[PDB]
């Protein structure tokens, strides 16, 4: 049995009032575009969500225009191709869910729209699982087509090793070392699970200041009104 | 509690047993009729034809 | 297999070889405390649901 919990990595957003490094979000979206989207799928987020987070409006519409998307009925009821728009969700690599299993060994690639928020451990898991591949220890033979990963429950993943150094070229020009790719794609997946992360932290800062202001004042009001009773002095004078 | 029981309470119980038993029979008949309890309804003569 | 209740129905006719092999299989060695005839009441007709346990 046994499972290895992921170590608590020092993420940039780990801080109580920290925000996702949006440059790393852009790089992680690049990684998803040219690595994970080939077999893995992401649905609940769309190109529209990219604007104001990691890509500008022009860049986002270019990214949407690059891909080809199936549309509704034609003038006679055909399935005509169409250049994707900003209001298009990220294309699914395999049309039917079973086709994903058929193309792979049989395990379908889970959707990443919540994989950070659905896997117990968070990014530390999703990061480490990518940078945790190693040769199986002696005495445990793995099936043909399977791969050994200590962090994955069961220690038998169906992934070909997805992230290796010099797999893609970041637009910025940062080194494409496997750790950098894994970190940036993990940050992007965290953004995918929690788009409102930065706004949540901002509102949390506002809430903390507002309550640190209000609570002393409301306590002072309570003390003011109750001071009639907290200072009363009784007296008993029976005859 | 032990404050009950004694002379007066036992004849109260005896007096109210017939009515309580009739109410229990009322509840039983109402239950078997309401849910159409088969187990009993394959025995009463004329209603056997319902099923 | 057919496809009932959102699950396949892995059904095999369990040829004599398969049933004798199952009878030869020790109950204790199996993790599930179950015996072949005790689960399926037909030696030549095994009726099993689709999917797989443990995901």
């Amino acid at each position: 049995d046994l499972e290895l919990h992921a170590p608590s990595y020092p993420w940039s957003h780990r801080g109580l009032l920290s925000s996702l490094d949006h440059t790393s979000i852009r790089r992680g979206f690049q990684v998803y575009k040219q690595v994970c989207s080939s077999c893995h799928s992401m649905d609940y987020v769309a190109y529209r969500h990219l604007v104001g987070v990691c890509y500008t409006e022009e860049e986002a519409k270019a990214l949407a225009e690059e891909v080809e998307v199936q549309d509704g009925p034609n003038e006679d009821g055909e399935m005509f191709m169409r250049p994707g728009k900003l209001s298009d969700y990220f294309p699914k690599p395999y049309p039917n869910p079973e086709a994903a299993r058929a193309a792979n060994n049989g395990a379908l690639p889970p959707d990443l729209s919540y994989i950070v928020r659905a896997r117990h451990g968070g990014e530390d898991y999703v990061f480490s699982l990518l940078t945790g591949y190693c040769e199986p220890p002696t005495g445990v033979s793995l099936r043909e087509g399977l791969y050994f990963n200590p962090y994955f429950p069961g220690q038998a993943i169906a992934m070909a090793p997805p992230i290796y150094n010099e797999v893609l070229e970041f637009d910025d020009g940062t080194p494409a070392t496997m750790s950098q790719v894994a970190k940036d794609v993990c940050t992007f997946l965290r953004w995918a699970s929690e788009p409102e992360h930065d706004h949540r932290k901002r509102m949390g800062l506002k809430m903390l200041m507002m309550m640190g202001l209000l609570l002393p004042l409301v306590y002072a009001m309570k003390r003011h009104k109750w001071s009639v009773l907290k200072s009363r002095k009784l007296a008993y004078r029976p005859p | 509690l032990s404050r009950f029981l004694g002379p007066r309470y036992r004849e109260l119980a005896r007096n109210w047993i017939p009515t309580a038993s009739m109410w229990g029979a009322v509840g039983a008949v109402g239950l078997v009729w309401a849910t159409d309890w088969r187990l009993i309804l394959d025995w009463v003569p004329y209603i056997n034809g319902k099923f | 297999a057919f496809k009932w209740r959102g699950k396949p129905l892995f059904v095999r006719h369990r040829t004599k070889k398969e049933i004798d092999q199952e009878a030869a299989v020790e109950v204790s060695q199996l993790r599930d405390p179950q015996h072949d005839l005790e689960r399926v009441k037909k030696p030549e007709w095994v009726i099993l649901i689709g999917v797989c346990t443990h995901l």
């Binding site: 968070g122 309550m211 309570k222 109750w226 | - | -």
Partner: protein, 379 residues
């Protein structure tokens, strides 16, 4: 000719229920929870409605609709996580309220106590049906397990279970009826809370000392309005911290996975506020016995006014009873933790001992200890 506050009928009821109500002068902070629950209730309703306006109770779209709420609805995520963590806060305040009632001998109010027990049961039912709505893996499988629980009842059994299921198992129909029952129930809770307050007002309130406070009553409005407002501000502080800093602190991550009936999640646990019952479930080997123990764990609160034997209403002047009560609380946290953990050798025996102790303290240790204290104090 007369003040409207105590002449207008609705104004008269509001006046003699919230403004001029004579309340004990020394009610501690624990009493504030009585207000907070009600506020939580409103916060549960008012927020909950705003989820119902973008939630479709359909298997094909429930999870997708919730994700749409959290990702596309303007400030929808605030509403969703405010609702979830507010339900958690509701159960926290409910447990603290029951603890206050048990401690300071409040169960002599009988009618209010029984109405409170009914409210408690209704709230647990509401939360159970609520967890199913997102239609996640944990939602689906917890619903499956809890409904399959009812198969243990004799005779009717499977027929009742399938009646609840609206079919052979949980499916679209079950989701829809859960959503409808979930919508209706909190208004019944509101009416029952009104009845609870109505019953409570006839006798007043139990002060911490437990003695009658008719010689120290104070008007409600000048003091307890602001006291309960401070309490509600503190509760808002805690709830908002939970929502805006660790939204999924008290929540299984696997609920963020669309419900796939073909895969059992490695762990199947209910919400954090049900584990104490579920652990009792795990304790009893017999299924029927397990369900009976599960319901009796909550039903035992009715027996409390009959099981109190000490000649002192409160527990403020009763040390050994205080130690017993705190042992009971620790046992409750132990049961919660055990229910959280899976069922193996280290935990099975601990669960059995915890369940036995939980029943024993309420039914045996507390009354006998009260007898001992009465004897020790020359009465």
């Amino acid at each position: 000719m007369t003040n409207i506050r105590k002449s207008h009928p609705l104004m008269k009821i509001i006046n003699n229920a919230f403004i001029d109500l004579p309340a004990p002068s020394n009610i501690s902070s624990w009493w504030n929870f009585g207000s907070l629950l009600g506020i939580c209730l409103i916060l549960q309703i008012l927020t909950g409605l705003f989820l119902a306006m973008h939630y479709t109770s359909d298997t094909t779209t429930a999870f997708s609709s919730v994700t749409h709420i959290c990702r596309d609805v303007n400030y929808g995520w605030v509403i969703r996580y405010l609702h979830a963590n507010g339900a958690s806060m509701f159960f926290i305040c409910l447990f603290i309220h029951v603890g206050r009632g048990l401690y300071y001998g409040s169960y002599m109010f009988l009618e209010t106590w029984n109405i409170g027990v009914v409210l408690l049961f209704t709230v647990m039912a509401t939360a159970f049906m609520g967890y199913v709505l997102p239609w996640g893996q944990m939602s689906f499988w917890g619903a499956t397990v809890i409904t399959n629980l009812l198969s243990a009842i004799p005779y009717i059994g499977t027929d009742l279970v399938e009646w609840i299921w609206g079919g052979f198992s949980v499916d679209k129909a079950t989701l829809t009826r859960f959503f409808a029952f979930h919508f209706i129930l909190p208004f019944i809770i509101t009416a029952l809370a009104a009845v609870h307050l109505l019953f409570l007002h006839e006798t007043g309130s139990n002060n911490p000392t437990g003695i009658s406070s008719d010689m120290d009553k104070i008007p409600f409005h000048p003091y307890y309005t602001i006291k309960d407002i401070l309490g509600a501000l503190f509760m808002m502080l805690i709830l908002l911290i939970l929502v805006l800093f660790s939204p999924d602190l008290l929540g299984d991550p696997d609920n963020y996975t669309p419900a796939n009936p073909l895969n059992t999640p490695p762990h199947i646990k209910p919400e954090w506020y049900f584990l104490f019952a579920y652990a009792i479930l795990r304790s009893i080997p017999n299924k029927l016995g397990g369900v009976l123990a599960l319901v009796a764990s909550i039903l035992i609160l009715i027996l409390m006014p009959m099981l109190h034997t000490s000649k002192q209403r409160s527990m403020m002047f009763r040390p050994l009873s205080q130690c017993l009560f705190w042992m009971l609380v620790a046992d409750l946290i132990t049961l919660t933790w055990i229910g959280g953990q899976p069922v193996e050798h280290p935990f099975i025996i601990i669960g059995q001992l915890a369940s036995i102790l939980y029943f024993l303290i309420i039914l045996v240790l507390m009354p006998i200890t009260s007898i001992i204290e009465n004897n020790l104090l020359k009465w």
